């Protein structure tokens, strides 16, 4: 897919992480990547870049702490990260470098990125309930539902209504840390018909856990 | 180095043009190339490339977009800010290691106002199983954001134990949407009667209400 990074989930301080970065359309023989990662809620953070011909730059401070390493014939650029803290705990992204010369350049295409979180806690499933509207009202010619989302760790969850065909009219409500466990839930809006017979269906996929249970209404 | 965006937030009604400023602690120009990026990062994916080396577009990007400056000093111009740019705008230096990142100026698009279409569910007979209770009420589609809404449990008895979240703002239209969870234990939603989702919106001086009456229980 033309960058995915996987390499996720839960891992506990003190361990390691190794998060794989497949590019496709390109290949690194010619390609550099940098690889980024965005701790929740702030900033952009650069960590390196490996360039065409395996050389390294990193970011001074991190440094230390990680190595970046391709393997040109798989497509897959890995970064090893060692000693986690907390604070590591952010969105890893992996970034195609497009170097022409050096007035001609550009970081110009970007991995969906994946969401590591560092803690000593296990990774909680979510309990899914839907929320259909039960005293009848003539509902006009569009009716909301709803999933929620209730109870799971670490983030991220993946809520799609009847697997993806219907991204219409879906509203997905940011997560809540609550005591210690996330919760989230998202409404969408169908016709009245499109509810009753033609049965709607949220589809929550919760990698860590491997949760991907589908919640009739 | 480090950057400095200005303003930190902005709102700009459509066809309006926008100014995000980026300044530089160091000269990141050498001979005459300013080697500074801006990244549209939406919501909720990954950053697009809008301009690099401070001028050039990157092709698929529309020419709204415009970049400027020299040094010190730069300036992403969007002009006419249409709804889909309601997002966070990056500005990158690679002047030299580290590639930092400015702090990103949300753009907020300024629209009319518009009022709620508020929703209620019941909880679902899978989480009284669990011994719980959750009434939801989506607060859908309105503008601006600020919205606060009450829970009134069977009489004008207020409560506590409330999630609130808020979607970002829509891209197609430029409206926000709510959910709001009060959570009881089933052992005290059994004993109780109407639940009233009361929303105070500047659209009106009146409340929205939607509520339900615990329907053969
Ligand atoms: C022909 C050559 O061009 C100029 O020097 C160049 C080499 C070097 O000095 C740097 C600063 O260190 C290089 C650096 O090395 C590599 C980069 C960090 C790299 C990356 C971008 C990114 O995103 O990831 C990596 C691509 C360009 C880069 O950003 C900078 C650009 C500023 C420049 O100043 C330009 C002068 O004109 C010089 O005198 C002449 O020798
Ligand atoms: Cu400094």
């Known amino acids: 897919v033309h960058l995915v990074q996987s390499g996720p989930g839960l891992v506990a301080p003190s361990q390691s992480l190794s998060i794989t970065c497949t590019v496709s359309?390109?290949?690194?023989?010619?390609?550099?990547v940098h690889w980024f990662r965005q701790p929740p809620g702030k900033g952009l953070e650069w960590l390196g870049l490996?360039?065409?011909?395996?050389?390294?730059d990193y970011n001074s401070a991190l440094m230390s702490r990680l190595s970046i390493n391709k393997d040109n014939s798989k497509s897959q650029v890995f970064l090893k990260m060692n000693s986690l803290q907390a604070d590591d705990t952010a969105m890893y992204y992996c970034?195609?470098?497009?170097?022409?010369?050096?007035?001609?350049?550009?970081?110009?295409?970007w991995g969906q990125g994946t969401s590591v979180t560092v803690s000593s806690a296990k990774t909680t499933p979510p309990s899914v309930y839907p929320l259909a509207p039960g005293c009848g009202d003539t509902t006009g010619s569009s009716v909301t539902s709803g999933c929620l989302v209730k109870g799971y760790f670490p983030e991220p969850v993946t809520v799609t209504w009847n697997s993806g065909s219907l991204s219409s009219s879906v509203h997905t409500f940011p997560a809540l840390l609550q005591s210690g466990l996330y919760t989230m839930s998202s409404s969408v809006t169908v016709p009245s018909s499109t509810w009753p017979s033609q049965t709607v269906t949220c589809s929550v996929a919760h990698p860590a856990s491997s949760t991907t249970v589908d919640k009739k209404l | 180095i480090v950057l400095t965006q200005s303003p930190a937030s902005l709102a700009v009604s459509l066809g309006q043009r926008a100014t995000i400023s980026c300044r530089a602690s160091?000269?990141?120009?050498?001979?005459?190339?300013?080697?500074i990026h801006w990244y549209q990062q939406k919501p909720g994916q990954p950053p697009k490339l809008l301009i690099y080396?401070?001028?050039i577009l990157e092709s698929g990007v529309p020419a709204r977009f415009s970049g400027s400056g020299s040094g010190t000093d730069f300036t992403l111009n969007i002009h006419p800010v249409e709804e889909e740019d309601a997002a966070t705008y990056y500005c990158q230096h690679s002047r030299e290691y580290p590639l930092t990142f400015g702090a990103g100026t949300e753009l907020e698009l300024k629209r009319a106002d518009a009022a709620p279409t508020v929703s209620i569910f019941p909880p679902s007979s899978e989480q009284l199983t669990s011994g719980g209770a959750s009434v939801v009420c989506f607060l859908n589609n309105f503008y601006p954001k600020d919205i606060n809404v009450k829970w009134k449990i069977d009489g004008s008895e207020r409560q506590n134990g409330v999630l609130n979240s808020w979607t970002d703002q829509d891209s197609k239209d430029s409206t926000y949407s709510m959910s709001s969870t009060l959570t009881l234990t089933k052992d005290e939603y059994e004993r109780h009667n109407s639940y009233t989702c009361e929303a105070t919106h500047k659209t009106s001086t009146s409340p929205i209400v939607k509520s339900f009456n615990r329907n053969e229980c």
């Open positions: 080396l401070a001028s």
């Open positions: 970034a195609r470098f497009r170097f022409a010369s050096y007035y001609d350049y550009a970081v110009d295409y």
């Open positions: 490996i360039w065409a011909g395996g050389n390294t």
């Open positions: 160091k000269s990141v120009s050498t001979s005459g190339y300013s080697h």
């Open positions: 359309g390109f290949s690194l023989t010619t390609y550099g």
